Every structure is written in C-alpha cells, then in structure tokens.
Amino acid sequence: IVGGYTCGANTVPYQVSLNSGYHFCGGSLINSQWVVSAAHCYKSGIQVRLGEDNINVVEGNEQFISASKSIVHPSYNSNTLNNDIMLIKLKSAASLNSRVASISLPTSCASAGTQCLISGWGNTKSSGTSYPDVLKCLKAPILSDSSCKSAYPGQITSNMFCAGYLEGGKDSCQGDSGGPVVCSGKLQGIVSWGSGCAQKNKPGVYTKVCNYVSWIKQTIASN
Ligand SMILES: NC(=[NH2+])c1cc2ccccc2s1
Ligand SMILES: [Ca+2]
Numbered sequence: 001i002v003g004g005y006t007c008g009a010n011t012v013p014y015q016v017s018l019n020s021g022y023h024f025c026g027g028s029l030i031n032s033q034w035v036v037s038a039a040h041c042y043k044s045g046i047q048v049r050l051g052e053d054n055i056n057v058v059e060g061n062e063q064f065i066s067a068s069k070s071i072v073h074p075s076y077n078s079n080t081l082n083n084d085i086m087l088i089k090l091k092s093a094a095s096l097n098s099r100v101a102s103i104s105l106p107t108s109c110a111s112a113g114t115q116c117l118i119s120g121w122g123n124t125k126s127s128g129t130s131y132p133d134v135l136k137c138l139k140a141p142i143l144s145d146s147s148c149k150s151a152y153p154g155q156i157t158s159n160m161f162c163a164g165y166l167e168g169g170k171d172s173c174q175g176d177s178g179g180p181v182v183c184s185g186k187l188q189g190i191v192s193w194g195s196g197c198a199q200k201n202k203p204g205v206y207t208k209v210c211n212y213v214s215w216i217k218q219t220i221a222s223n
Helices: 145-151 213-221
Strands: 015-019 023-031 034-037 047-050 063-072 086-090 115-120 136-141 160-163 180-183 186-193 204-208
Touching: 015 034, 023 047, 023 180, 023 186, 023 213, 034 186, 086 213, 115 186, 145 160, 160 186
Parallel strands: none
Antiparallel strands: 015 023, 015 047, 023 034, 034 086, 047 063, 063 086, 115 136, 115 180, 160 204, 180 186, 186 204
16 A cells, blocks of 8 residues: 555554465455455465454464365456456355454445555555555555546446545555455455556556445355
8 A cells, every 4th residue: 555544553443454374365254164365366375364464473362264165257357357356165164353343335326536445565655665564454446437447448347436645646456455445334446456556547446346245245245
C-alpha cells in the first residue's frame, strides 16, 4: 500500500495473509470456514494466517490454518484477469473473536464516490521496494467507470472497477493482491491489478465482488 498509514493491530479483523513459506497474498475471511482472495493468488500448499498485524512476529493473536481446498472462479482468464476471484476453505474453522472476524458480502454494488478501506502488507514505494511487516491501510473512493476505462482502454470489463486517486500518490501495490476493499461494512472489491503503483492516471483495478455473491453462496454451500 503506497501513501497509506499503519492500521493498528487487529483493527482490520477480517484481513488474512496467505503464506506458502512466506507471505504472498492477502485475503478476507467471509465466515469461520472460508476466505475469498484473488484467483491470480492461486498456489498449491497454502496456509491461511488470521489475527495478524506484524507478519514476522508471533504477537499472540494469530491462528495459522491450512487450506483443505481452493476453487478459482470457473471463468477466470489469466490473460485479462477478468473474474479474478478464488475461494479457500480452511481445514478447521477459525475461532472468531475481537481480533478475527468475518466481513459481510454486499447486498448491492456500491456507487462511485463511496469511500472504501483497502489494506495489506504490500510494497509501500511507487518507485522502489519496501515491504512493511505490519498492516497498512488506505481510504480511497470508487472512481466512475468512465475514468477507469479512459485510464485502461479495452481492458476493463463489467467485473472490475477502479478505486484511488487519478493524481497518484495513494494506491494498493504488489503484495496487496487478493486483499479487501470494504465500503460501508461490505466487501466490495479484491486487489487485482494496476499499472505500476500510485502513478498518475493509473488507479487500482479491483474485482467487483457484488457480481459474484450468488456464485460464492452456492459454491460454499456445496463444498
Ligand atoms: N496499482 C495497483 N493498485 C496495483 C499494482 C499491482 C501490481 C501487481 C500486483 C498487484 C497490484 S495492485
Ligand atoms: Ca504476527
């Protein structure tokens, strides 16, 4: 996350770190047994880490649970990143408490202009590499589709939306992939892609979760 701030320990209780020997993606806990992340975060051998703040230090509130299965969306296109969403089932249910909680799925899609909270342990420099150990947060509004499409011509589908500042400076970045974009208490997006990070006229592109609620619900009830 570039141009953001330190969240504070466990203030984003639904935030997850996917680890395969090291942290490689973020995710969101939607209920005690399931996590939603980005399909481009797919790997075999994933351990889900809940109640994290510093991911390099066991501070006492963590729960490390292995995944029993991963389900990448049936129509995910790795070339365009269209339908960039994946569900991960935990081998055991997480113990929800003040530090580990689930986030609600949306009942409708949010309006451009709505302010959201984006978080993750990704790079914090636009030009350079600095990976933080504690969770970083960013409040950014959803941009209109017109500004999103003019920034990325022929690349935005109806399953993506842009959030950020066209002036650059604040944005999500690699390492933040799969993480949550929460607006008004609901999970509206998933960190998916962008051109560089915090660049002028290159906002972040997020998977539009409101388009997958039926698929999520149906998939979890049958697995
Ligand atoms: N500009 C951005 N918001 C992003 C850029 C990248 C690049 C790689 C992986 C994830 C992301 S999010
Ligand atoms: Ca830790």
